[PDB]
Design a protein around this nucleic acid. Sequence first.
RNA 1: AUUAAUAGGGACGGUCGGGGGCAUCAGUAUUCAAUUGUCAGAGGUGAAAUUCUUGGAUUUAUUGAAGACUAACUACUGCGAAAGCAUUUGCCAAGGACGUUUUCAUUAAUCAAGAACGAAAGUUAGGGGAUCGAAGAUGAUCAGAUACCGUCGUAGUCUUAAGACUAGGGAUCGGGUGGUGUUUUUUUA
Lengths: 162, 175, 132, 111
Amino acid sequence: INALSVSPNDSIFATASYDKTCKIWNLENGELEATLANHKRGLWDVSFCQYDKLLATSSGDKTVKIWSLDTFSVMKTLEGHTNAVQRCSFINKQKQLISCGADGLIKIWDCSSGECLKTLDGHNNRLWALSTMNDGDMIVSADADGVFQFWKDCTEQEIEEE
Amino acid sequence: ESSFMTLFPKYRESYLKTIWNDVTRALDKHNIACVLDLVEGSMTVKTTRKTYDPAIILKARDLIKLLARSVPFPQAVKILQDDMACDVIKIGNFVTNKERFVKRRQRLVGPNGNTLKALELLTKCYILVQGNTVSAMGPFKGLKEVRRVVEDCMKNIHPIYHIKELMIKRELAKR
Amino acid sequence: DFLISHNEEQEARTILGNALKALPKRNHIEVVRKFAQLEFAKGDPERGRSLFEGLVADAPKRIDLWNVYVDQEVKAKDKKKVEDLFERIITKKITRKQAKFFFNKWLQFEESEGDEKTIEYVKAKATEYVAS
Amino acid sequence: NSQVFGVARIYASFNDTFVHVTDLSGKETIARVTGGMKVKADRDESSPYAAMLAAQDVAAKCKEVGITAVHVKIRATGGTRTKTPGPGGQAALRALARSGLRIGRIEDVTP
RNA sequence: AUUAAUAGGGACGGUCGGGGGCAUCAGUAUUCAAUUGUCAGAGGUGAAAUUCUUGGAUUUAUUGAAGACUAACUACUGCGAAAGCAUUUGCCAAGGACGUUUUCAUUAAUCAAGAACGAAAGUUAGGGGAUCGAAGAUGAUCAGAUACCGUCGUAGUCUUAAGACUAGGGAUCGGGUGGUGUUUUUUUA
């Protein structure tokens, strides 16, 4: 298994794994209801945005697919990356999904829109870990080197400036 | 430089000596020491310094393979150009029984030759089966599908349907 | 099994995976069954249950792997694991004679345990499974 | 010849080719010609135009490294394949003649 | 001590199989862990789609694990209780030409039921699924027994699929002898 995903409302449990399987099953039990496999190389991480109840699969290839809570279909997708993604972060704004990748960059754009907004390239080579916390949209990413970068939402201060 | 040498069959040296005059007169100008060592029973060619292109060593290696395939040497050593491919496929390692090999060779020959060489003519291949190997010359695009069809016909399945499918593919190639 | 007696588990598991890679795939199913039987008896019961579960996941029509998992669960005689195995057997699909043997195995597990309320619940679930 | 020499191990197929820049040992890290990066149309790479286009940049980096003479090592796919290249061998020979590389120690590395 | 189809046979020495059993000797191409000329494009390629996709993928600056098989030479020239057999060794059931006045006259002729291997995608999904069914049940410990020895369900059990030629003329094939040189065979006629 590459990585797991826990539902913050304590309902379901999904795992992305090396055998291209997005096995989604219960939390109180191990009852496998479904799994998903329509990718290229594998599936690395699954992102849960339970405010709108979507399922974002950060897969082995550069393609990132967005799945619903019920129909297990593809509502949205993310492309435009170069090497690999391996980790996607859910967003306090509930739409502007954050994606780090194996090229040294963080790309964040609105999932409900589907077009690129901000691609930030503070790191150089490859990203390993990435996480967020809620009330300040405060993004920490750890790359293949030892350097870490820190980005927070201050857009209300910037729109006051111009 | 180095040299390319290979031994030939019993009748290959007698066949190659009849056309060894103009072959050596063009190879030596193209820096290939094309000689027939009758004492050792082999044909060798050394890459000299009188070549204006580096493809002379590759063309002489293909010509030596065509000459040692017991095929027509003057009709198979003119593949020195880029758009001219001559190669030999060894189909002898496909069957074990001699009667099954004879039955497969009759299917590969076809009825009176032209019943199975029509797809070879449609693929533009000068196919000639000699013993356990079959040598064909022509365009590389036309011979790649021809050699794949030859490998399919060399399998244990009946090549009558494969020849009919090759004629159907040749008829569908007109579009 | 000699390495398991010599307390070599991770090296033997890597050797078993290399031996299964070298062996044919048709014989690898019986070799995995022999390895799961050896791991349940002589090796760690957690490794034996993991090998029995993985073989059950690999073969979706293996009543032998269901019986081997039942035999591994009966080796420890855990009532919660037998109830979990009965729930997994209830989750699996069986034939007419296969469900009758599964209900008989569940009744034999209930008779070995001694819980009359669970035996009545198993009999009610077997009657509901029969009504299909 | 003042040791200005190298070797080109050309592993080529019917529809693809690759170049390994070699010394007598594994040295002379010059370049490596790609197969279809010059043109992506699934027929120009089989043609000699895209192979010579990749060889033009390969020979430019080979001159940057400092290898003049090229010892040919013509490698094919071999085995159950066709055991022959497409037009990559003729395009590399034409690129060698255009670059004026010295011909010597030419061999075939086909399997 | 009439018979010798020398009906037939242990033998008898020279000489032999890519028949075949091991015994070492080469590695031709692949898999993984290696690891890069820090190459993300490479299989396929009616153009396509499609397999693997920036988890290094032609490769590699080669270690091991394994199987694997004889390339132009070359090729059925041959050799099989038989389901078949293509370098290089030491051993053997046995098989091999031949001569024998030497092996003996006495080593039953076809053979089915009794035995030896026993082969041109041991593929697909529902159904009766009953007699029974390996994989494991469980009884006696035997320092040691899935069978030693009773008790159960699954692939199974069985169908569902990939001229009245009238005539000549040269050449051709199959021979042979006049002479001619080697080959055949130079006792193995």
